[PDB]
Design an enzyme around this catalytic site. Sequence first.
Site, PDB file in Angstrom:
ATOM      1  N   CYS A  46      19.133  -0.136  -8.997  1.00 50.34           N
ATOM      2  CA  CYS A  46      18.102   1.003  -8.573  1.00 50.34           C
ATOM      3  C   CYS A  46      18.838   2.089  -8.276  1.00 50.34           C
ATOM      4  O   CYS A  46      19.468   2.389  -7.280  1.00 50.34           O
ATOM      5  CB  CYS A  46      17.440   0.590  -7.410  1.00 50.34           C
ATOM      6  SG  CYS A  46      16.081   1.866  -6.922  1.00 50.34           S
ATOM      7  N   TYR A 104       3.088   4.899  -5.588  1.00 50.78           N
ATOM      8  CA  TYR A 104       2.901   4.352  -6.912  1.00 50.78           C
ATOM      9  C   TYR A 104       1.361   4.878  -7.460  1.00 50.78           C
ATOM     10  O   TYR A 104       0.749   4.117  -7.956  1.00 50.78           O
ATOM     11  CB  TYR A 104       2.526   2.832  -6.297  1.00 50.78           C
ATOM     12  CG  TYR A 104       4.016   2.141  -6.272  1.00 50.78           C
ATOM     13  CD1 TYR A 104       4.705   1.619  -7.189  1.00 50.78           C
ATOM     14  CD2 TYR A 104       4.889   2.336  -5.009  1.00 50.78           C
ATOM     15  CE1 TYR A 104       5.899   0.779  -7.268  1.00 50.78           C
ATOM     16  CE2 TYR A 104       6.194   1.705  -4.876  1.00 50.78           C
ATOM     17  CZ  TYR A 104       6.589   0.975  -5.858  1.00 50.78           C
ATOM     18  OH  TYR A 104       7.963   0.353  -5.828  1.00 50.78           O
ATOM     19  N   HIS A 153      15.768   0.201 -12.090  1.00 50.38           N
ATOM     20  CA  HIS A 153      14.628   1.406 -11.638  1.00 50.38           C
ATOM     21  C   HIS A 153      15.347   2.688 -11.657  1.00 50.38           C
ATOM     22  O   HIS A 153      16.313   3.055 -11.108  1.00 50.38           O
ATOM     23  CB  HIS A 153      14.616   1.054  -9.981  1.00 50.38           C
ATOM     24  CG  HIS A 153      13.984  -0.171  -9.480  1.00 50.38           C
ATOM     25  ND1 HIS A 153      13.533  -0.431  -8.386  1.00 50.38           N
ATOM     26  CD2 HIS A 153      13.426  -1.124 -10.397  1.00 50.38           C
ATOM     27  CE1 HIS A 153      12.885  -1.544  -8.230  1.00 50.38           C
ATOM     28  NE2 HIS A 153      12.707  -2.079  -9.656  1.00 50.38           N
ATOM     29  N   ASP A 196       9.629   3.239 -11.249  1.00 49.71           N
ATOM     30  CA  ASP A 196      10.052   3.086  -9.726  1.00 49.71           C
ATOM     31  C   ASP A 196       8.814   3.634  -8.869  1.00 49.71           C
ATOM     32  O   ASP A 196       8.131   3.023  -8.286  1.00 49.71           O
ATOM     33  CB  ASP A 196      10.991   3.293  -9.405  1.00 49.71           C
ATOM     34  CG  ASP A 196      11.613   2.547  -7.923  1.00 49.71           C
ATOM     35  OD1 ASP A 196      10.583   1.645  -7.572  1.00 49.71           O
ATOM     36  OD2 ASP A 196      12.745   2.629  -7.349  1.00 49.71           O
ATOM     37  N   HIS A 197       9.197   5.001  -8.652  1.00 50.25           N
ATOM     38  CA  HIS A 197       8.252   5.809  -7.943  1.00 50.25           C
ATOM     39  C   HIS A 197       7.901   7.030  -8.497  1.00 50.25           C
ATOM     40  O   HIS A 197       8.734   7.269  -9.327  1.00 50.25           O
ATOM     41  CB  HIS A 197       9.023   6.313  -6.782  1.00 50.25           C
ATOM     42  CG  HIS A 197       9.170   5.058  -5.794  1.00 50.25           C
ATOM     43  ND1 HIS A 197      10.295   5.341  -4.442  1.00 50.25           N
ATOM     44  CD2 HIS A 197       8.909   3.922  -5.383  1.00 50.25           C
ATOM     45  CE1 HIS A 197      10.611   4.413  -3.866  1.00 50.25           C
ATOM     46  NE2 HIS A 197       9.839   3.237  -4.574  1.00 50.25           N
TER      47      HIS A 197
END
EC number: 4.2.1.8
Length: 395
Positions: free
Chosen positions: A273, A370, A300, A353-354
């Site tokens: 990530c 999200y 991520h 991821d976001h």
Amino acid sequence: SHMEQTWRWYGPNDPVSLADVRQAGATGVVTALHHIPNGEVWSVEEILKRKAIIEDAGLVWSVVESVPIHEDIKTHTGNYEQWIANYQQTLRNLAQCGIRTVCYNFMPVLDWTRTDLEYVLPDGSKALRFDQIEFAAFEMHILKRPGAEADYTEEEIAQAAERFATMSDEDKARLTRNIIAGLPGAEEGYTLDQFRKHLELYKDIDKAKLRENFAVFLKAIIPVAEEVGVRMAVHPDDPPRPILGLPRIVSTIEDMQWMVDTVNSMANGFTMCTGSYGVRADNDLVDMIKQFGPRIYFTHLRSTMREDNPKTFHEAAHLNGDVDMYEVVKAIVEEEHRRKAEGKEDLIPMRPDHGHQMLDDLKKKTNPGYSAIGRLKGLAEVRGVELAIQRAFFS
Ligand SMILES: [Cl-]
Ligand SMILES: [Mn+2]
């Protein structure tokens, strides 16, 4: 283009539909059985149900995120032995259902953490933010943790007191919920009193002790994962620093090394990530990928941006944060090609991821962050980067 593109979907109740996911250009879904209580076995029936729904939409279930680790395991108290056995059975059940990559974390008490879920950027979109002064204000004036002052500079302490005095009643409650109620994907949530007494369970658990507890989990779980053909991919602490006087032990390259040293099996691997590791400037993301690439089974690919106070950060646009996305993706691509040269072919699934909350999503109550459009955008950006790297370097 040939990159394994995946997308976290929370299930039938997610406001983001599987049609949105396909149109975003993802071919894989990342999901978990969130409705199953912490530490209980995920049955074949429940797994196949979620799988069928996903395949129904012309997608595949690629990665599990996450199988939660009960707090009893992390503190090495109570019913930890049963929880471990159940975790083992869950992995067996997943594998039996053809789902072979499991993302998980060992963040104690709190999962990934933000102070502000609706931070308005200059373009009007909303980002997630960890404001160090908001967090200090919570710790010292709301939680009142003795003696949280050690974690802060004199300036930060002064700024916290001042920020707290400007906060409405509702500001204080919202800040509290933001920090302790659990963000999307989190499998723990607390009231302030539940939280405060839960912290007490860690009074004698330092970094070394938490590692011991994690070692017990790993030495029990990995051989099962290896036996059944599942690969485990640990997610880093987010933020990757010790907060609230609790240790956080998946934060740096030393921690990555510790995990390999603790259990050698290749089933013991990593989720790279970049959003989480990149929070702190001393993490060399490219070197991390170069050294631990063979064990990276999930990525991520998002970016944060550190502010004037380097402990303050917000979620940036994917190509415009502290993460050098070009270099990171190049390293990942290089790792996929070395696998192929070893005579294999073993792609690393990614998810954006976001994302920022933008366009139509601004009029919605969303899972922070999200929402669909901002994540579609990050995914499109990384898709472009990866495609051009493939053509520049591997055609
Ligand atoms: Cl995603
Ligand atoms: Mn992540």
